[PDB]
């Protein structure tokens, strides 16, 4: 309707006098720590109710209808889990039997501390790759070769397959303990704002470039070539050239088998996703392609006939717990910190997707403790880092999943695949397992189509995507995440250092002020020049704030005062012998200021002092209360710059000048 | 007087229709690049005048009295500068004559490109300490010892003084050449915003730590003790422990002489600073104490009698130019970058001080270019990095200085002290030169008294002072500057990630809105809840923004919908068988937003969608045009969330809500 007000021009002091303030809360640190820790039984039961989420949904189960859906979904993901687990184990340089352990022990721990319902904890292609980089860099192949075999001329320095795996397993298991501890520290100390720095373009660009390194790494298994485990700078570029140089030393059997299941698993996946309305339950294409693979490889002995690469290394048994090799945390702390954060970032991202669709909330701090205890419990049983794969958790939700009981039943399928089953997968070719991983890389390879979308959107978000994608390819993969966080935080500083300053003018017959570079019919007060400056002034944009003022007034407060004294010598010598035209005032619309950064507030007192010497007043328009209370402490309100210079509304500053020139020409 | 307005409630569309916008400037990069480079002679004359500032003040001289003033200031500053150079030569591990060289050529170079008038370019204690640390880390003492001298049992591995000085001088020349190249690159590319990151507390803490390290080094030199040139982590602590262990192996004469000259110089300096009104020109205490030291040390032969440490290494002659040892840039790039940055920062600080004290302006890029050319010209004549010392430039201002001619006369003093004089300073003890440096450390040691002042002020800036001071002591000195800039940027990011959110309410009979946590008599509209959020929303403060919304509304937009759908199943099953109370709207006062970081506008749209499902409208109050134009591109205004939801003024949203609840119950 109508918007009419009638109030005096309360600048700063006409409003601060009659308005009583609130008494601030006293320090009383002695009572604060006492009031924090409660003694009632409600607080004691509350902290345990959220620490062990099993006491929430297990007593409130729905055996009538929920138990039936968990069994059919458990046996579904159990077959997909035991195959993806043994396939992702090749990305971490660990033997194939330790991949099944990563799909059994972490699930048993994510049943009493987990705060999700539709998350299948297990291996992950990106996370297992980062673990494999640590195992290869701290235990290479040329560090275990023993000279034996009565060679021709020199010592028979043959491969030392066998006892070499014990150096890789103890190294991978020790890494997971450090990963679990870091997650417990972030969850215990309630510090979770570090994961907020991993923006969606940063994680999207990181996973896209990580999919390339997985593609090159898995291509080595498909072509059955032998690289030199190049690690460091341009690791993916160097290993890609070595594969092309060793194309002749490939295996036709592994190539024709690996490329065949690549087309089959990908075509059926896109056919099932597109034609979802026909059949609700996705057909286990990854499972049926493995059963037919081990069946063909068993009849025709591809190990002896075509010299293919088979597993033939499944002992089909458990192992006693082994203590981690403590002492290697110094050379792995940098890599473990990156793995622990990227594992939690993917866990929450995938978890929140299936949380808003089934309308339930997932706690953030509990997710750290949940994966923290799982990684520690898996480290004591020779496992690698546990996460949640989007492809594996999609099977548990599509086939019907309600609680974590579907995952517990999925652990029984992996359970029988270790004690009794597992030996049947002996003649399975490693190229088939190296292909089901590439078939799931389609979800991350299609993320490149978001770069043109982010370019039409905020351009700074598209640069972070390309920066992280390239930096996670040139300089390793763990350093790419660190080089992306620093570049992302630097972009935030660049946006608050170079703000969007305008020339706000007045709209006729109203009180609203809009930018002069966006509208035409905006009138400005005669003599007054209004300037808006977002991105509150700090030590970095304090010099730019001076340039913004000099640009909107047309002159410089230093050169004008210099020319005055340079010309005043002629005026003061006439007795012995014998520019700032338009600017009347400067109303600074500092309404978007958040902090002060006293290093920068010293210039605000200087700016008023500079313009006061050239007969120009520098008023303020929209300073907040939390900033004005900060100026009083930083030594700004002296016997010259009083509070009357500040105002509450931008139109109040103009009314103060218009009423001042009428009573004083 | 009175502040009355009368306008309709223009929310977003009632104001955007009748208000014509301005046509944006076309890209036309061809004409922009063509219009950038000018063809007229005026632009060429201007760039030549601003590149070589000698053509400005030299033809406009005032010989009559300026000649005598510049002559006296030049002889005084020449004495002071040759003393400071022969003193700082010990901090750079180079011989004494090379300090005199570094105090001669940079002054001649800063005469045609310099843009200041009261700057005495030369050595500097901090820069000399950094150069000496680099030289010691890249050329230690145990890397040149030759076994010779027919020792007792093992090889007589005596000291190899001599040819080591050539290697140190070549290394220092390469370092200063790289510094000059980096400065020229920073100046020509017009990139000067990197120096803005060096805040005043950061520079203060860095200078305090550098003064502490200089004190430790000069105490090592005075006591005549030999350390193991420890460099790296905790270098100052290690060398202090080594000095304390080797106290017995000192020289009584050098120690007592150093203590006496320290006391004398400090007493005379404080007496001249306190009683300034008595005598205007400061008495050259350094000059007279050096004269009396070299006079006493010549009569009584302190070299043979008391076995004191004298110079006895002044050849008193020039040297042909030497080409720098190019190829060592890889192992000194970071050190040269830090040295150039700190030198330019100190130079700009001193120039701005002595320019605002004499009412003139000094350019930044021209200063960078001038210092780069000076360092490049000094690198070709066996010198180190050049800067301006606050103690040396104070003499040129106190004794009377108008132009850089005082520097040209100051070079003639060093000129006559290099070719002919200088040999008279042969018996001068190194402890006397190592004491004037400590006497000049009083200005930086008193900066510790600013920590209590910055604590009462903005506390985040007082932590940067202590953080930089400690980090530049534990982990070297060059890394402390890098560890301070990153910490400062992280502190800036933390201030824009955790904003100061309030509960703004309405003041009766007015239209201004103040924080509810600062005033008592503030009334809020029935049902409406206003929330202000500074520090524009980005990928880091999205969860913080959600938490602030949930705290200001009292509930959670997800848990309420969860409970609604969990209670709705009981309602929809009765046919088969047979919270959000106070919150009516949420006006977000997003007036302090600068950018939106589309990852954040996605969360904004998600919030608006979530609150729409619980019958709660989320309006906006003070969104700027530069943010709305970004939201229009980021895919926010769909067929459901129109622009009518946005408003121009905070009171307009309240008026609209009141009209809606009056016209519709």
Secondary structure of A40-76 in HEC code, one letter for each residue:
CHHHHHHHHHHHCCHHHHCCCCCCCCHHHHHHHHHHH
Pick from A5, A458, A652: CB nearest B630: A458
* Region of residue A407 (left: phi > 0; alpha: psi -120 to 50; beta: else): alpha
- Edge to edge, the sheet with strand B585-589 lists B528-532, B585-589, B617-620
Q: Give the integer Cα–Cα distance in Å for A650 and A507.
A: 12
Residue A4 with chain B: CB contacts under 8 Å: 4-6
**Resolution of the experimental structure, in angstroms:** 3.2
Nearest CA in chain A to B2: A8
B532 forms beta bridges with B502, B589
Closest CA to B629 of B612, B617, B646: B646
User: What six digits make up the tokens of B124?
Assistant: 């500097």
CB of A183 closer than 8 Å to CB of A175: no
User: 3-class SS at B634?
Assistant: coil
User: 3-class SS at B19?
Assistant: coil
Nearest CA in chain A to B497: A193
Pick from A197, A599, A649: CB nearest B199: A599
Q: Answer whether B540 sits within 8 Å of A492, measured CB to CB.
A: yes
Q: Answer whether A559 sits within 8 Å of B361, measured CB to CB.
A: yes
Q: Give the integer Cα–Cα distance in Å for B539 and B501.
A: 17
Element (H, E) at A383: none
Pick from A199, A492, A594: CB nearest B534: A594
User: What six digits make up the tokens of A180?
Assistant: 């679990």
Buried b / exposed e across B18-48, counting CB within 10 Å, b at 16+? eeeeeeeeeeeeeeeeeeeeeeeeeeeeeee
Q: Give the integer Cα–Cα distance in Å for A125 and A441.
A: 9
Q: Give the integer Cα–Cα distance in Å for A542 and A595.
A: 13
- Parallel, antiparallel, or unpaired for β B146-147 and A157-158? unpaired
> What are the DSSP E strand ranges found in B308-450?
387-388
Q: Give the integer Cα–Cα distance in Å for A404 and A351.
A: 13
Buried b / exposed e across A340-359, counting CB within 10 Å, b at 16+? bbbbbbbbbbbbeebbeeee
For an interface test with B, give the residue of A344, A468, A489 to mutate (most B CBs within 10 A): A489
| Residues contacting B353, CB < 8 A, separation 6+ | none
Closest CA to A99 of A117, A109, A87: A87
- DSSP category for residue B573: T
Q: Answer whether B22 sits within 8 Å of A535, measured CB to CB.
A: no
Closest CA to B517 of B509, B505, B508: B505
User: 3-class SS at A582?
Assistant: coil
Q: Answer whether A562 sits within 8 Å of B361, measured CB to CB.
A: yes
CB of A415 closer than 8 Å to CB of A104: yes
Instruction: Give the phi and the psi of residue B623 in degrees, each rounded to 5.
Output: -75, 130
Closest CA to B402 of B73, B161, B6: B73
Q: Give the integer Cα–Cα distance in Å for A278 and A272.
A: 9
Q: Answer whether A3 sits within 8 Å of B9, measured CB to CB.
A: yes
| Residues contacting B566, CB < 8 A, separation 6+ | none
CA distance B127 to chain A (A): 23
Q: Give the integer Cα–Cα distance in Å for B366 and B624.
A: 38
> Number of C-alpha atoms within 13 angstroms, CB side, residue B595?
25
Q: Describe chain B by its helix, strand, coil percentages, rounded to 5.
A: 60, 5, 35
> Number of C-alpha atoms within 13 angstroms, CB side, residue A402?
16
Nearest CA in chain A to B502: A626
| Residues contacting B184, CB < 8 A, separation 6+ | B368, B369, B372, B373, B376
Question: Exposure of B66 by Cβ count < 10 A (0-12 exposed, 13-18 middle, 19+ buried)?
Answer: middle
Q: Answer whether A460 sits within 8 Å of B597, measured CB to CB.
A: yes
Residue B500 with chain A: CB contacts under 8 Å: 594, 624, 626
Q: Give the integer Cα–Cα distance in Å for B648 and B627.
A: 13
Pick from A1, A454, A598: CB nearest B461: A598
Q: Answer whether B457 sits within 8 Å of A635, measured CB to CB.
A: yes
- Parallel, antiparallel, or unpaired for β A528-532 and A585-589? parallel
Pick from B493, B509, B599: CB nearest A489: B493
Instruction: Give the phi and the psi of residue B329 in degrees, each rounded to 5.
Output: -75, -25
Provide the Cα torsion A247, A252, A253, A254; round to 10°.
20
Nearest CA in chain A to B352: A558
Q: Answer whether A626 sits within 8 Å of B500, measured CB to CB.
A: yes
> What are the DSSP E strand ranges found in A572-661?
585-589, 617-620
Q: Answer whether A599 sits within 8 Å of B201, measured CB to CB.
A: yes
CB of A530 closer than 8 Å to CB of A583: no
User: 3-class SS at A504?
Assistant: coil
Q: What is the largest CA-CA distance in chain B?
A: 122
Nearest CA in chain B to A593: B592
Locus of tokens 């080094």: B217
Q: Give the integer Cα–Cα distance in Å for A174 and A224.
A: 29
The residue count of chain A comes to 665
Q: Answer whether B193 sits within 8 Å of A540, measured CB to CB.
A: yes
Give alpha helix (H) positions in A155-251: 164-188, 200-223, 235-245
User: 3-class SS at B2?
Assistant: strand
Q: Give the integer Cα–Cα distance in Å for B546 and B556.
A: 9
Q: Answer whether A458 sits within 8 Å of B520, measured CB to CB.
A: no
- DSSP category for residue A421: T
Question: Exposure of A173 by Cβ count < 10 A (0-12 exposed, 13-18 middle, 19+ buried)?
Answer: buried
- Parallel, antiparallel, or unpaired for β A585-589 and B121-122? unpaired
Q: Answer whether B493 sits within 8 Å of A497, measured CB to CB.
A: no
Residue A634 with chain B: CB contacts under 8 Å: 457-458
User: What six digits make up the tokens of A558?
Assistant: 């230093």
Per-residue HEC secondary structure of B477-519 comes to CHHHHHHHHHHHHHHHHHHHHCCCCECCEECCCCCCEECCCCE
> Number of C-alpha atoms within 13 angstroms, CB side, residue B211?
19
Q: Please state at what angle helix A285-299 crosses helix A252-274, rounded to 10 degrees.
A: 150
CA distance B598 to chain A (A): 6
Using alpha carbons only, give the angle B451, B452, B456 rounded to the nearest 5 degrees: 115
Q: Give the integer Cα–Cα distance in Å for B69 and B61.
A: 12
Element (H, E) at B585: strand B585-589
Element (H, E) at A532: strand A528-532
DSSP string, B272-339: HHHTTTT-SSPP-HHHHHHHHHHHHHHHTTTTTSS---B---------------TT-STTTHHHHHHH
CA dihedral over B111, B112, B118, B119, signed as positive or negative: negative
Q: Give the integer Cα–Cα distance in Å for B295 and B427.
A: 9
Q: Give the integer Cα–Cα distance in Å for A232 and B483.
A: 24
Pick from A15, A510, A539: CB nearest B196: A539
CA distance B429 to chain A (A): 43
Q: Answer whether B6 sits within 8 Å of A2, measured CB to CB.
A: yes
Residue B456 with chain A: CB contacts under 8 Å: 633
Instruction: Give the phi and the psi of residue B559 in degrees, each rounded to 5.
Output: -65, -35
Nearest CA in chain A to B532: A624
Provide the Cα torsion B8, B9, B10, B14; round to 10°.
-70
Closest CA to B598 of B620, B646, B631: B631
CB of A401 closer than 8 Å to CB of A73: yes
Element (H, E) at B146: strand B146-147
| Residues contacting B221, CB < 8 A, separation 6+ | B90, B430, B431, B434
For an interface test with A, give the residue of B21, B598, B650 to mutate (most A CBs within 10 A): B598
| Residues contacting B494, CB < 8 A, separation 6+ | none
Q: Give the integer Cα–Cα distance in Å for B402 and B37.
A: 35
- DSSP category for residue A157: E
CB of A208 closer than 8 Å to CB of B555: no
CA distance A41 to chain B (A): 24
Question: Exposure of B571 by Cβ count < 10 A (0-12 exposed, 13-18 middle, 19+ buried)?
Answer: exposed
CB count, 10 Å around CB of A199?
Answer: 26
> Number of C-alpha atoms within 13 angstroms, CB side, residue B557?
28
Q: How many residue pairs bridge chain A and chain B with CB atoms within 8 Å of each other?
A: 243
Pick from B8, B200, B514: CB nearest A599: B200
User: What six digits make up the tokens of A159?
Assistant: 């491969």
Counting DSSP H helices and E strands in chain A, the numbers are 27, 10
Q: Give the integer Cα–Cα distance in Å for A544 and A75.
A: 64
Question: Exposure of B439 by Cβ count < 10 A (0-12 exposed, 13-18 middle, 19+ buried)?
Answer: buried
Pick from A518, A599, A625: CB nearest B518: A625
Q: Give the integer Cα–Cα distance in Å for A22 and A39.
A: 31
DSSP string, A255-303: HHHHHHHHHHHHHHHHHHHHTTTT-SSPP-HHHHHHHHHHHHHHHTTTT
Q: Answer whether B22 sits within 8 Å of A634, measured CB to CB.
A: no
Q: Give the integer Cα–Cα distance in Å for B547 and B550.
A: 5
């Amino acid at each position: 309707c109508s918007y009419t007000v009638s109030r005096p021009v309360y600048s700063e002091l006409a409003f601060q006098q009659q308005r009583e303030r609130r008494l601030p809360e006293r320090r009383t640190l002695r009572d604060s720590l006492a009031r924090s820790c409660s003694c009632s039984r409600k607080r004691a039961f509350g902290v345990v109710k959220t620490l062990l989420p099993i006491l929430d949904w297990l007593p409130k189960y729905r055996v009538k209808e929920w138990l039936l859906s968990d069994i059919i979904s458990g046996v579904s993901t159990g077959l997909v889990g035991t195959l993806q687990g043994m396939a992702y184990a090749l990305l971490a340089a660990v033997p194939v039997q330790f991949g099944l352990y990563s799909a059994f022990f972490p699930i048993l721990t994510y049943f009493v501390f987990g705060t999700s319902r539709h998350i299948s904890v297990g291996p992950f292609p990106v996370v297992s790759l980062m673990v494999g980089s640590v195992v290869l860099s701290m235990a290479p192949d040329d560090h275990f070769l023993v000279p034996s075999g009565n060679g021709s001329a020199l010592n028979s320095t043959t491969l030392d397959t066998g006892t070499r795996d014990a150096a890789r397993v103890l190294l991978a298991s020790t890494l997971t303990l450090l990963v679990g501890i870091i997650q417990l520290v972030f969850g215990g100390l309630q510090i979770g704002f570090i994961v907020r720095y991993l923006a969606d373009p940063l994680v999207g660009g990181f996973t896209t470039a990580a999919a390339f390194q997985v593609l090159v790494s898995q291509l080595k298994i498909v072509l059955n070539v032998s690289t030199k485990n190049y690690n460091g700078i341009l690791s993916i570029i160097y290993t890609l050239i070595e594969i092309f140089q060793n194309i002749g030393d490939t295996n036709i059997a592994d190539f024709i088998a690996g490329l065949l299941t690549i087309i089959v698993c990908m075509a059926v996946k896109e056919l099932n996703d597109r034609f979802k309305h026909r059949i609700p339950v996705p057909i286990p294409i990854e499972v049926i392609v493995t059963i037919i693979a081990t069946a063909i490889s068993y009849g025709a002995n591809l190990e002896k006939n075509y010299n293919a690469g088979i597993v033939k290394s499944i002992p089909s048994g458990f192992l006693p717990p082994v203590l981690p090799s403590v002492g290697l945390f110094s050379d792995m702390l940098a890599a473990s910190f990156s793995i622990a954060v990227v594992a939690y970032a993917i866990a929450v991202s995938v978890g929140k997707v299936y949380a808003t669709k089934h309308d339930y909330v997932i706690d953030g701090n509990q997710e750290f403790i949940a994966f923290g205890i799982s990684n520690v419990f898996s480290g004591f049983f020779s496992c690698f880092v546990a996460t949640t794969a989007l492809s594996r958790t999609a099977v548990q939700e599509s086939t019907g999943g309600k609680t974590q009981v579907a995952g517990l039943i999925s652990a029984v399928i992996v359970m029988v695949a270790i004690v009794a089953l597992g030996r049947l997968l002996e003649p399975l070719q490693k190229s088939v397992l190296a292909a089901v991983v590439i078939a799931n890389l389609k979800g991350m390879f299609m993320q490149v189509c978001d770069v043109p979308r982010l370019w039409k959107q905020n351009k700074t978000d598209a640069v972070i995507w390309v920066f992280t994608c390239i930096m996670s390819i040139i300089l390793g993969l763990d350093l790419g995440l660190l080089a992306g966080l620093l570049f992302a935080l630097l972009t935030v500083v660049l946006r608050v250092q170079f703000p969007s300053w305008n020339g706000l003018g007045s709209v006729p017959s109203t009180d609203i002020y809009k930018s002069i570079t966006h509208y035409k019919n905006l009138e400005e007060p005669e003599g007054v020049k209004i300037l808006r400056f977002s991105s509150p002034i700090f030590y970095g944009n304090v010099d730019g704030f001076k340039k913004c003022i000099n640009s909107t007034v047309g002159f410089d407060a230093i050169r004008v005062y210099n020319k005055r004294l340079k010309a005043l010598r002629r005026i003061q010598k006439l007795i012995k012998k014998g520019p700032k035209v338009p600017i009347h005032s400067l109303v600074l619309d500092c309404g978007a200021v958040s902090f002060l950064d006293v290093v920068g507030v010293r210039s605000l007192r200087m700016i008023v002092k500079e313009f006061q010497r050239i007969d120009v007043n520098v008023y303020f328009a929209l300073l907040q209360d939390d900033v004005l209370e900060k100026m009083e402490q930083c030594g700004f309100f002296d016997d010259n710059i009083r509070k009357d210079r500040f105002f509450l509304t931008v139109h109040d500053a103009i009314l103060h000048l218009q009423n001042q020139v009428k009573s004083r020409e």
